[PDB]
């Protein structure tokens, strides 16, 4: 199944933050309405934040997270969780290799902000 794609409410500001846990340098692309809105890159095996940014989900609300290591797409896992019918997390894990820890880049999208 498709992973890393989330329908946010339209025109809504959201946070996107990525963490790295791999020897491979991670590239995290965040697309809004199918166009690149942010790109984070970095290398850590200690959960370093490789990027954090506030974006607007725009007219469609469609947000897609892509993760690659030197252009090779990682395998993605994702889900959305809503707490008290108000607080939204869109969660991505990714696997660039064989050990299936799925933490190689970890991406958290949260909304609403403010």
């Amino acid at each position: 199944a498709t992973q890393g794609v989330f329908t946010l409410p339209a025109n809504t500001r959201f946070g996107v933050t990525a963490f790295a846990n791999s020897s491979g340098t991670q590239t995290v692309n965040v697309l809004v309405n199918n166009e690149t809105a942010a790109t984070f890159s970095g290398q850590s095996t200690n959960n370093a934040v490789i990027g954090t940014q506030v974006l607007n989900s725009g007219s469609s609300g469609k947000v897609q997270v892509q993760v690659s290591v030197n252009g090779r797409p990682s395998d993605l896992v994702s889900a959305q969780v809503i707490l008290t019918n108000e607080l939204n997390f869109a969660l991505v894990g990714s696997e660039d290799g064989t050990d299936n820890d799925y933490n190689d880049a970890v991406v958290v999208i949260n909304w609403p902000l403010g």
Partner: peptide
């Protein structure tokens, strides 16, 4: 990356 290659010349 780094890890698997080192487990590769091994087991």
């Amino acid at each position: 990356x780094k890890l698997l290659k080192l487990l590769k010349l091994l087991x």
